[PDB]
Point group: C2
Chain length 334, copies 2
């Protein structure tokens, strides 16, 4: 056991245990999840789900230590006599009644509680099953890449079934026999998706069986877009005004795009991307000052806000404002 970090950074995060323990499946998520935006959603979102049961006021976070790379890779593979623990369906051809890869990845997070001066004990674990919304496959090397769409209902049904199997195994895993297990089902977006996927449900096992599944209303939108105009017109309009204001004084900077994460239909976090070509540093400074004014005037202060102004060579400026905070803060990279 031991201490932890002292800076939390954000309430959505837990303090992390030290000495640092690196994931026993470190990096697997990068090879299994195509989009970095799905990766962020998966890991950040599972911390969000954990906060329903484990307060960051009282619990510490550690990357998954109990399920290792090799074990996770066996579970992620198709079932088979040579891979009996595989969670995905056994192959029955690449044709029509084909059985897809439903499961792309399994994420483990450990939640520890400090019990005295120098000791922390495991208070619970969270698991995410990252499900495919589109399964990509080839019928031969160098062949075309085919897509099999999977509905929310089918991926939800498969996820619930696999989650049962996963819980039973954790229960048979040394040092996890007792710990409450929280499992969440994540829907990965398509590879060419304009926005990442989202969590869809979760359940908790205090004992030997999962509770009823609770639905999660989480969705990511691009701003501006027809979908945003439709479901969140006010956010879309505000964003369009923000954009137009930028272009009124900076006509060619038209790449302004927003990535809005919604929970229960309310904007929780808006990431505004502004990719630029570099023409000089004063240009960046003045632009960032102006955008900082514009977020004050156009962007609702009920969501966490990040404006990433960057060039090909890296970040140029950052503007941030926390939910319910009046003033944005800007930094010019040096």
């Amino acid at each position: 056991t031991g201490i932890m970090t002292k800076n939390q950074i954000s309430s959505n995060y837990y303090k992390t245990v030290l000495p640092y323990k690196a994931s026993k499946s470190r990096g697997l998520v990068v090879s299994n999840i195509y989009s970095r935006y799905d990766i962020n959603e998966l890991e950040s979102g599972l911390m969000r789900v954990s906060q329903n049961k484990y307060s960051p006021d009282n619990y510490l976070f550690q990357e998954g230590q109990y399920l290792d790379k090799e074990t996770l890779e066996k579970w992620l593979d198709r079932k088979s006599d040579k891979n009996p623990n595989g969670l995905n369906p056994a192959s029955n051809g690449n044709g029509e009644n084909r059985k897809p890869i439903y499961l792309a990845h399994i994420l483990e997070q450990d939640y520890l509680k400090q019990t005295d001066k120098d000791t922390v004990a495991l208070g619970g674990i969270s698991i995410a099953l990252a499900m495919n919304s589109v399964d990509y496959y080839q019928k031969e090397k160098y062949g075309d890449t085919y897509e099999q769409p999977i509905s929310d209902s089918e991926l939800l049904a498969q996820g619930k079934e696999m989650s049962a199997t996963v819980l039973n195994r954790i229960r048979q895993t040394k040092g996890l026999e007792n710990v409450p297990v929280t499992i969440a089902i994540y829907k990965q977006g398509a590879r060419d998706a304009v926005a990442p996927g989202n969590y869809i449900a979760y359940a908790t096992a205090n004992g030997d069986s999962l509770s009823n599944w609770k639905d999660i209303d989480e969705k990511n939108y691009v701003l501006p877009s027809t979908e945003s105009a439709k479901d969140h017109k006010t956010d879309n309009d505000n964003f369009l005004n923000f954009k137009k204001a930028i272009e009124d004084y900076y006509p060619n900077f038209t790449g302004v795009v927003g990535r809005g994460r919604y929970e229960d239909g309310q904007l929780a976090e808006l990431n505004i991307d502004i990719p630029l070509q570099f023409y000089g540093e004063a240009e960046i400074i003045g632009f960032t000052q102006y955008v900082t004014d514009l977020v004050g005037q156009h962007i609702p202060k009920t969501a966490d806000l990040q404006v990433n102004i960057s060039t090909s060579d890296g970040p140029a400026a950052l503007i941030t404002r926390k939910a319910n905070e009046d003033a944005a803060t800007a930094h010019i990279y040096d």
Copy 2:
């Protein structure tokens, strides 16, 4: 009008509606290192605050010296271009005269005269000097280097500044305004740290004042040079680096870039380039580094920690001079 957020005491508020530099992008063509470009432009703003308070003046990128004029002046002097400030060519041999002047930067400083009007109140000019002149003897051939001493580039700089001021006084709109001119020394292309300003002078008329030395220098931390000149900052940086490798021995490429003014650390930029293995990993690491800056980095200087991957920024930690708590942001 103007921008309302200043962002930093080192910066001016900017004139609106925005007017692009009349020499937009020339600095990128002319100055090899992005770190020299930042020094050149931010550094000219710091110089300008000796004469034009950001409480009183608004900033605009240079409008009076356009690209064609600057390019004309940046050329070597010749019969077809008597206007070039650089020495006439006399071969690529032992007697080779180098390109002393790489770039000329103009910054305009405006005063608000009424509710919706501004007027030019002063200008600042930087002459960016080469410390190493790079050239080819044959098209497509090896790149040869001609180093230039501080004393020679300072002298050439002072002489050219006088000529530049003369021409400024023949430029429409610039006949009467206060002018500040500063000499900037560009670092080498493969230098571990960028160059620095070395002197500046002012003129309300057609004659520059006496030149005032500027004591500015950039260091890499840790390094032999910083261990000698600024031992305490170097030691603190080593301790910081060591605490990182204690728990995260994998990524050891932590490097600091320290800008010093009059011998004191003014700004510390810590670069931590990472490979991406996952998001939780970044979050935990950023919390830990945020802890370490409080424990190891004295709050006497503005601080920036850029934790990044090859595909973009991952986390930023900042702390202003004299600010007790650092603030971190995780990129999403």
